[PDB]
Design a protein around this ligand. Structure first.
Ligand SMILES: Nc1ncnc2c1ncn2[C@@H]1O[C@H](COP(=O)(O)OP(=O)(O)O)[C@@H](O)[C@H]1O
Ligand SMILES: Nc1ncnc2c1ncn2[C@@H]1O[C@H](COP(=O)(O)OP(=O)(O)O)[C@@H](O)[C@H]1O
Ligand SMILES: [Mg+2]
Ligand SMILES: [Mg+2]
Ligand SMILES: [Mg+2]
Ligand SMILES: [Mg+2]
Lengths: 692, 692
């Protein structure tokens, strides 16, 4: 309803425009996006009749839009001398500029409007103004361009002749980047008139030895354009610096050779380019150009190139032998990525290619290949792009496309979970505490947690092959080409969770059971298959999360499974250290909680004990006859008591008969650690639990 | 010494070659890089005399190099009919191919050798072979190309005529990517003869409706080439699909409009392209092309474009109000980055521009700007590239270059450390435990640690402004444009360390002291300035690391400073629970360690206590008269004793008079926690310490 007038002007519906304005429409309304008024639109369309009509209804002739452009400036873009004349009589100044420093003279040059350019010059426009813009952009070295530069960049030949021959434009003016008009023409993608423009500028004394945005000289730009005529004209300049190098340290000749340009490369050689630019001869051979090889040799090129003394050692131990080779051999670069699809550097075969060693930004990485369009390709990439903040995932370095082939670069690891615990299974013939199982599973839990909640994705392929191991040896989640977005559907989250539970049994059993048949048996057989009670209750919780399935992963990180043996020990002694349990009380809140489940390990625990240690502990209460009884409370009283004095110096006898105390109590009563946890799980008696 | 013969051949020094071969030189030597033999080099140079000479000295005529190429195949690349004839008589098969599936016929087409092509055809070469390569590349959809495709891609016009008119080549053959010869010519960067090639193929019945590597049709490719003639010829095909979209969903007309091609866009419109491709009219207006606007309107283009219903909420709370706007408004894309250098989206000014809001891969990020060449630009980028595995650093999304301006994209945070603890200072009027100080400093310590040791860089600008805070509120390290590589020079590592110590005082004091004058006073005044003893000893260690300065950051993570109050409490009670300390022993190893330092807090601690609580505790030993004495051991005995019974149910009197026990003991004796740590720092009595 507020846009009616702007839209009427835009449709050039004069009758409707008249009707709206006479109806009471806001003539100076500004649309939110760019601050455009009906007048701005009328001028842009170069419709002087609509402009007049709007002005007579009280349109502000000098009202700027958001970029600071005036109707006068827009008139130059349109090329309307009539509208320029009009606004100059309405208070516009000929040298006024927008917030980016664009004057009307510049816009006429940009858009190639000759009549407007000529008119503005005679109305007193300044030809050699360098664009002044915000201090913001100026620190970037933005701004500083001129009208001559604009006409060059856009390739307006007639405008350029007029600027140089009739209007006294400074040919060698430079912007804040240091670019002159010659550089601007050669940088431009509008190549249509670049030959004429170049000759024109050079004949007017334009400087050939001036740098662009990447060390690029005019000569280097002509070489990269593969333009023989440009190179020929540029090389006629008696003082051109042929041996200048861009930001990559590459010279014009080297670039000519790499770009397979024999005629240009030979020309540079005849005009006296040095042949110590880099791998000159060997590059020509690799491109199978002996004609170019012979030319380079006669002009004195070196015959064995030893690259700069780059200090480099591979970080990987498993690879690295291969990495040293890949680092040494020649390879064409794909963007930032250097790699070779070859059996020597393949680490694994995959559905759309394989995984390969590579260097992403001089950094050693693993490279996953895809057919660029495939569903797998864009499931992996889409997931990796949305999960950069996930610390437990394999970190995403970047990707490169080549010819419909996607190369996803990713942190390089040593081996999979399978390969790792194959070795760990052969050495751990002991009944030893499995620290590795804990800090690997806790690491993977955090990956799936942030994946679901922070990244908003579901993995859908939790398996040992997809968990990679550092050289440290930390664990990381990987392979995402089977990921799905919205976790809203609980069946997808459930699918990931009951894959996690089957994975918990895998690591604890040290991989003796293959993951493929672990997925074959039900999630009820897998629970009954778990060795200790701590994993038994852990994977059971993963198969039956509470009302909020969301919270049910942070909670599990505080499960007895993740507790060390000393931690299980310390807290059992801490609960047994309750005053209500030593002075057994009927009304105790803690004692009624611990009361039962007919089948348990500790129902009559005083018989389960040795019991020569038992009688030696019972002697402490022989006076009042307060012996230990078969309650859950007195077992914890016993554990707190035993572990306390077992450090004193009259108890070496008890040390031998019990062995490690934290280990012994768990053996004879495996049911205990989980039982006390399930009970006190939501009480004030949780301070006894260890921190995380 | 083994390369003499290869080098002699490469120099075309026949006399030297003769001399070497007659001397006993290995005629079939293969250089390590590519498996090149003297024969391979002789053929590549197309020197039949050297080839003969080598063969007469026993050169294997069919020995392949590493890519599987034979001397026969190399002869086709050279275009030598004589050498092809020679090797065919020496056992080479006309249809033999390298390991990538290249035949001699194909190479002659690739390199445009007409005499060789004609010769090979008459010697029975198969014209229509599709390249067979390794199963590796084939899963990528590599391979499958033909000789016709090669000649098209390289732009050999005469070769193409011969293949189609004289040799019966399948014009509509497709490779494993689905590309035919027409698509290959239009994809090529060798545009020199693309007009002639296109007409030739189309006249021979080439299919126009076939997809390239990015959904690109021949028509879309011609439009992107800005080639009016190509578009004209392609549009003469009576059944071309004008409305096909590439992988971005962009049609040929839309691309023509975005590329500012009025004549092409009008042609597509006249040939009946639909005008519901996207933001057609509005794109033409933004480019100030009313002529194109009028054309699009007459052909029925929509006048208000509402983008697809992309569900999106900003993640940030501080920003996000601005992010919603930046997400909504139009902006030209710089690579992957969408952002606006404008005051509304600026978050901070900097030396070479500022920091701005932006979207890197549809992901909200902070954008840091640089002049691309500057030392600051390549100090930031070089550091960020080498530290992607650092979890505690600000994560590096990527960078885009535009016109000599570098835009470094990086994870977006809420505020700096200063801005955060300004608010925390106004609310924490309590003598409360500062949890925030701990988990922020421990997080920053880990950043500097991995920076120095894992990333191999020194920060050189540790300050509150450079520590950013999450919305969670986690801490992250940032700003790297003052980083230096090799940490070998200890003065650079020291400089970072004594910046860390001054930072520890900053956070603990809640930022009441500005960081700038903290750097003004000496690192000896800063130590004496620290409030509690735990920070006093912490920043002192940072100013005087041991022999190995390297280890001296992991060690500090186990300092009492990082211990919670309960943790300081628990371990003091644990040490006091030693049997040697309750039954005070002369020969005790622990008791002699704890013995002194004339000035301390606990020298005569029994007077420092209340002492109504003291006398109530001394009543426990009134029988044998074993009262507490002013040793360090009995103080810990007291702490272990008090904290033990203070939970029992006859001690509410002691709870009031002491308050929080973990807090009270630290008040009256601030010296204690650090003293016991310094003592037991390297003993078996470290089990009492808390884990990490
Ligand atoms: N970053 C890496 N470091 C080491 N090995 C890797 C890496 N990425 C993949 N691999 C290896 O490649 C195999 C397959 O890669 P993956 O991403 O699982 O592909 P797919 O989706 O076909 O399973 C993995 O099982 C693993 O052995
Ligand atoms: N990722 C980010 N999130 C939020 N704020 C940022 C981020 N990066 C930089 N800033 C803000 O910009 C300021 C300057 O950026 P910085 O990288 O320190 O540049 P300089 O090298 O000029 O100090 C910082 O103090 C901080 O306030
Ligand atoms: Mg997999
Ligand atoms: Mg997969
Ligand atoms: Mg800074
Ligand atoms: Mg800085």
């Amino acid at each position: 309803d507020n846009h009616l007038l702007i839209k009427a002007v835009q449709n050039e519906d004069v009758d409707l425009v008249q009707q709206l304005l006479e109806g009471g429409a806001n003539v100076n309304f500004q649309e939110e996006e760019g601050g455009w008024t009906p007048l701005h639109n009328a001028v842009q369309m170069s419709r002087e009749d609509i402009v007049e009509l709007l002005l007579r209804h009280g349109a502000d002739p000098v009202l700027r839009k958001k970029n600071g452009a005036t109707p006068f400036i827009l008139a130059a873009i349109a090329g309307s001398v009539k509208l320029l004349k009009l606004f100059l009589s309405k208070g516009a100044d000929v040298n006024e500029c927008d917030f980016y420093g664009f004057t009307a003279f510049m816009e006429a040059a940009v858009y190639g409007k000759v009549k407007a350019l000529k008119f503005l010059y005679k109305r007193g426009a300044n030809v050699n103004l360098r664009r002044k813009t915000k201090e913001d952009q100026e620190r970037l070295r933005k701004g500083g361009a001129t009208a001559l530069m604009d006409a060059a960049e856009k390739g307006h030949v007639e405008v350029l002749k007029i600027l140089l021959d009739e209007m006294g434009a400074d040919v060698n003016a430079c912007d804040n980047m240091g670019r002159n008009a010659l550089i601007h023409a050669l940088l431009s993608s509008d190549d249509s008139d670049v030959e004429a423009i170049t000759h024109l500028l050079l004949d007017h004394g334009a400087d050939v030895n001036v740098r662009g945005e990447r060390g690029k000289t005019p000569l280097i730009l002509a070489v990269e354009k593969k333009h023989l005529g440009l190179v020929q004209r540029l090389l006629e300049q008696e003082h051109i610096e042929i041996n200048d190098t861009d930001s990559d340290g590459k010279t014009a000749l080297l670039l000519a050779v790499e770009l397979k340009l024999k005629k240009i490369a030979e020309l540079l050689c005849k005009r006296g380019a040095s042949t110590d630019c880099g791998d000159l001869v060997m590059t020509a051979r690799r491109n199978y150009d002996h004609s170019l090889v012979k030319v380079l040799l006669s002009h004195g090129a070196k015959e064995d190139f030893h690259p700069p003394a780059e200090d480099w050692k591979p970080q990987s131990s498993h690879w690295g032998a291969a990495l040293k080779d890949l680092h040494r051999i020649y390879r064409p670069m794909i963007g930032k990525l250097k790699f070779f699809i070859d059996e020597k550097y393949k680490i694994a075969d995959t559905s759309e290619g394989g995984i390969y060693l590579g260097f992403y930004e001089k950094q050693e990485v693993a490279v996953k290949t895809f057919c660029e369009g495939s569903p797998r390709a864009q499931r992996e990439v889409s997931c990796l792009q949305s999960s950069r903040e996930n610390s437990h995932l394999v970190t995403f370095y970047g990707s490169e496309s080549h010819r419909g082939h996607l190369f996803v670069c990713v942190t390089l690891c040593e081996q999979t979970l399978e390969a790792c615990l194959d070795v760990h299974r052969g050495e751990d013939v002991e009944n030893e505490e499995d620290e590795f199982a804990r800090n690997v599973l806790s690491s993977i839990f955090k990956a799936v947690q942030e994946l679901h909640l922070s990244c908003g994705y579901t993995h859908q392929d939790l398996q040992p092959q997809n968990i990679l191991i550092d050289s440290k040896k930390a664990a990381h989640l990987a392979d995402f080409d089977k990921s799905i977005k919205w976790a809203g559907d609980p069946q997808e989250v459930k699918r990931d969770l009951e894959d996690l539970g089957r994975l918990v049994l895998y690591v604890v059993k040290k991989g003796s059971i293959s993951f493929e048949d672990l997925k074959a048996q039900s999630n009820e057989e897998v629970v009954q298959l778990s060795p200790d009670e701590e994993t038994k209750d852990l994977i059971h919780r993963l198969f039956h999360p509470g009302e909020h399935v969301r919270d049910c992963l942070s909670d599990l990180l505080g499960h007895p499974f993740f507790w060390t043996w000393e931690s299980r020990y310390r807290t059992l002694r801490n609960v047994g250290n309750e005053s209500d349990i030593k002075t057994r009380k009927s009304e105790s809140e803690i004692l009624r909680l611990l009361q039962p489940e007919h089948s348990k390990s500790f129902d009559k625990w005083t018989t389960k004990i040795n019991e020569c240690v038992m009688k030696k502990m019972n002697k402490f209460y022989e006076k009042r006859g307060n012996f230990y009884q078969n309650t859950v409370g007195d077992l914890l009283k016993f554990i707190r008591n035993l572990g306390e004095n077992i450090d004193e110096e009259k108890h070496k006898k008890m040390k031998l008969k019990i062995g490690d105390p934290s280990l012994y109590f768990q053996k004879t009563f495996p049911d205990l650690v989980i039982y006390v946890y399930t009970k006190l799980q939501n009480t004030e008696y949780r301070k006894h639990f260890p921190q995380t």
